[PDB]
Design a protein around this ligand. Structure first.
Ligand SMILES: [Mg+2]
Ligand SMILES: [Mg+2]
Ligand SMILES: [Mg+2]
Ligand SMILES: [Mg+2]
Ligand SMILES: [Mg+2]
Ligand SMILES: [Mg+2]
Ligand SMILES: [Mg+2]
Ligand SMILES: [Mg+2]
Ligand SMILES: [Mg+2]
Ligand SMILES: [Mg+2]
Ligand SMILES: [Mg+2]
Ligand SMILES: [Mg+2]
Ligand SMILES: [Mg+2]
Ligand SMILES: [Mg+2]
Ligand SMILES: [Mg+2]
Ligand SMILES: [Mg+2]
Ligand SMILES: [Mg+2]
Ligand SMILES: [Mg+2]
Ligand SMILES: [Mg+2]
Ligand SMILES: [Mg+2]
Ligand SMILES: [Mg+2]
Ligand SMILES: [Mg+2]
Ligand SMILES: [Mg+2]
Ligand SMILES: [Mg+2]
Ligand SMILES: [Mg+2]
Ligand SMILES: [Zn+2]
Ligand SMILES: [Zn+2]
Lengths: 91, 114
RNA sequence: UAGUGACGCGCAUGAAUGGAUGAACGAGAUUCCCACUGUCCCUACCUACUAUCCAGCGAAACCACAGCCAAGGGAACGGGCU
RNA sequence: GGAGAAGGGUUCCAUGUGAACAGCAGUUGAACAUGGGUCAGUCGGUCCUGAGAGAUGGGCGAGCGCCGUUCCGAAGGGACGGGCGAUGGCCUCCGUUGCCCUCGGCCGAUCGAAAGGGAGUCGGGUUCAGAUCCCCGAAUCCGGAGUGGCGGAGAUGGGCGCCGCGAGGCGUCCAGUGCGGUAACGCGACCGAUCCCGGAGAAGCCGGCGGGAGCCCCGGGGAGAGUUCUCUUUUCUUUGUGAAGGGCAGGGCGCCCUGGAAUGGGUUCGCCCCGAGAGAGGGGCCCGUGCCUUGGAAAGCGUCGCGGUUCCGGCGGCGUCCGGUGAGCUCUCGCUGGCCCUUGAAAAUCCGGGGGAGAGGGUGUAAAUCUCGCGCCGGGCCGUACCCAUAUCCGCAGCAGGUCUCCAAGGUGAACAGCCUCUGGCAUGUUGGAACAAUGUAGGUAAGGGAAGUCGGCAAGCCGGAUCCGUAACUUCGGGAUAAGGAUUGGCUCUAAGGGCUGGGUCGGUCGCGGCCGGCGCCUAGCAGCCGACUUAGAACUGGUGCGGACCAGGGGAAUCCGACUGUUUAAUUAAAACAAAGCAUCGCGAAGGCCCGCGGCGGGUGUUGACGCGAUGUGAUUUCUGCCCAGUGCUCUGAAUGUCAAAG
RNA sequence: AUGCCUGGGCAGGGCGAAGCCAGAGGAAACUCUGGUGGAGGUCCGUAGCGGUCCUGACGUGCAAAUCGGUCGUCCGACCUG
């Protein structure tokens, strides 16, 4: 609450588009423009390049992830279920 | 202050119509048309963002005139792949082949056991 | 007889044929106030270009015939008739 | 003002006439009549492909033809290596052609950009009109090069047995498709096919910073010059070097070697980086459009003086010099970031790499040189004048309309705003003279009142820049906001604050003011010298209260209705509440499918698509809510329990 | 008029979103102050694009739709060959 009270990133939109829409898009913007930690090099340089495309500055590795977040909950659940099914099948 | 004009019939400031200022022995400023800036070859590995060293950055058709020495470097995969990538390739090939030999020996031992 | 605020008795209001509200915005439609001023009381004066006259150059629209009025009668409002 | 693209097509240049035209005139013209003028391997077409167009095969169609561009195709006529046969040329040696074996993906013929991609030329001079095209002088690209024209690289190593004092010579065995550096990589070269891999070509918009150049600015030297009634070491103009090579500054590196860091460090305007190796040292690579040099002072320019009646592209003396600055403008190069439910071209063409199918001569030679340095020959065809716009184009015309770009000085000023000026350009826009009547068109000023005028403050006026204070209701908390409301602004003379570069290693010894050696002072509270850009604040004095003195340049407040907003709309009467818009809610479709085109086809679009998609509707930001009714008209579901129900049987 | 391909262009200022730095308070959660930063289908405004009002000029006009002032927008659903 240094410069703005309760808008933060959506301060660029001004008074337009409605309060609820700006509040809804605030979390999406924060997740989209956040830099994540790459689980290949250990550095916090994972940045979103395009929709579902995440790139590491150091590793130079591109990872196919979510649209606005590096990992979606559905993808993690599917990965866990696939690992469980593989362990049940191959044994 | 002297003002100058294009010396060709192309009046539009396109990519092919780039000029620079030059002073002639006649003490007048004229337009000299410049060649496009060349780029050094990129490594064949595709992971290194930098461009390869030891090769002149000229237009692709200029390489026909350029000698062989300026177009590559005195290494394996010289002028197409970086030294770091080549070293990684050497180590990876040796380690993978050694692991294959170990796996083959283990499989032969398993065959002999049964 | 304008505007705003309340009432509902609503010829013929009304809920995505959307109702109510609503910050910012609008060469959108209205009311009042401050300042301002020739909009006005009540008009005047000044400047430039025209209009004016001259040298030269020079059309178009229109044209039954033409062109002073009162009354009368008449196709019930005439330049013509008395 | 100087040059282009489309368009025009002789309008361009010289001479002559004034019949007609240029709404007056004309000795003038873009009029008329004679002639003249456009010079290319390097500038573009030509080459490539893009969106797309369009043959063959195939299908349809009564038919001219149409569908479609890989789909219902025996779709490459090419190449290397080997063999045979034939001719030609000193049938030695090679070329050509024919046959046989062998090898072989492409992806649709073809067209499609004078602004996309695309190797390679500049300087001076020169015409009445053309010159990166002509001449002079310097280069460069591509192709050919057989008999290779030359040199150079593959190159002239060792061992052994002899001879000779030695240098060296002879015979034999071989090696010899290069060399250097730990490394990045470098050296003028430095075999190689079918095949495979990669790169370049080949990429969006915006912000910030840094380097280079052009221009502008300041302090000077010269040369030519306006003023000089007073002053002014005066003000005005000029004061340089091409492409292509070599060398060196200057930038960048996500390149390498030593080493391992918390007391975390390095560092930018911002960022950012570091045990996956940061600071500190030593190297390497790329761009070098900048500086020096060949080019090149011979030429160009400014001056002073001449040869020659004239023609005459001449002859000569001089100079073309030394420095500093700037969030300054433009171009370019390079780093660094921000935005996308937007990710921002293809092909021609060129190059590097992985492999070793094969070749070479055998110990002085050869096969090879993605040719190392020179040397020889050629580069065909088309366009090239001029205007490019208040007169060479389109509007019936020399029409206040329309029509795509590049170059961009000084002052004031935030500014590419407005105003004045320099280089350059012109005559005021199809005529001039004489007066200043009324009505006009375009500007203004008006005592007192201040909207009493009018449907309506229509029109005009008021405020206006910058600095210092201050700023309400409401609100989606972002705004409102320059809210509203106040004070200052000139000129002159000062004060204070905001920075860089260099300098001490001084003493003694030694060597030739400089270099080396040792301990000293280590300025570690820093000072001395020299430079340079603009700013901010404060103070005094002063003018008839004048000072954003011209120009530039918001009138505000309280409310109602509508549309969330940004955006779009009836070219030529309606810019709005209309349309659109994100949000919200329904409908259909799992591919022989939904929606749609099509006379036609195994046709086509969505679809290079797959329910977070495509297609069809309604409403229209945020908040709240979305009441009841299936009687009617629609839509939809199943149903041999079925009344009516055509053809055929 | 719309879609696609390939090119070109858009002065000078205001407001000040993320992110970052320093100081202060706190037991923590964290909160204030001063800076840096330059985002926005942001604002004033030129070029460009368009055409609200004067229902001005003109209305056998410069013009079979032009002209003057005043205007909307001017980094994006932008303008244009
Ligand atoms: Mg081109
Ligand atoms: Mg009233
Ligand atoms: Mg009703
Ligand atoms: Mg209704
Ligand atoms: Mg009559
Ligand atoms: Mg001109
Ligand atoms: Mg002429
Ligand atoms: Mg005449
Ligand atoms: Mg073509
Ligand atoms: Mg380092
Ligand atoms: Mg020409
Ligand atoms: Mg004229
Ligand atoms: Mg005049
Ligand atoms: Mg005149
Ligand atoms: Mg008065
Ligand atoms: Mg008004
Ligand atoms: Mg207000
Ligand atoms: Mg109300
Ligand atoms: Mg609207
Ligand atoms: Mg209209
Ligand atoms: Mg209108
Ligand atoms: Mg509905
Ligand atoms: Mg029903
Ligand atoms: Mg009118
Ligand atoms: Mg009239
Ligand atoms: Zn990583
Ligand atoms: Zn690499």
């Amino acid at each position: 609450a240094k410069r703005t009270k309760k808008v933060g990133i959506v301060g660029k939109y001004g008074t337009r588009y409605g309060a609820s829409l700006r509040k809804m898009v605030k979390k999406i913007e924060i997740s989209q423009h956040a830099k994540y930690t790459c689980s290949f090099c250990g550095k916090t340089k994972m940045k979103r390049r395009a929709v579902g495309i995440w790139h590491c500055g150091s590793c130079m590795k591109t990872v196919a992830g979510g649209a606005w977040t590096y990992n979606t909950t559905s993808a993690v659940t599917v990965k866990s279920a696939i690992r469980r099914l593989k362990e049940l099948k191959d044994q | 202050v002297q003002r100058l004009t294009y010396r060709r019939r192309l009046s539009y400031n396109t990519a092919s119509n780039k000029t620079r200022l030059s002073r002639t022995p006649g003490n007048r400023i004229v337009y000299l048309y410049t060649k496009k800036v060349g780029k050094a070859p990129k490594s064949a590995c595709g992971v290194c963002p930098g461009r390869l060293r030891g090769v002149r950055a000229v237009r692709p058709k200029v390489l026909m005139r350029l000698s062989k020495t300026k177009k590559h470097v005195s290494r394996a995969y010289g002028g197409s792949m970086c030294a770091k990538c080549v070293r990684d390739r050497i180590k990876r090939a040796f380690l993978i082949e050694e692991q294959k030999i170990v796996v083959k020996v283990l499989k032969a031992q398993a065959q002999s056991q049964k």
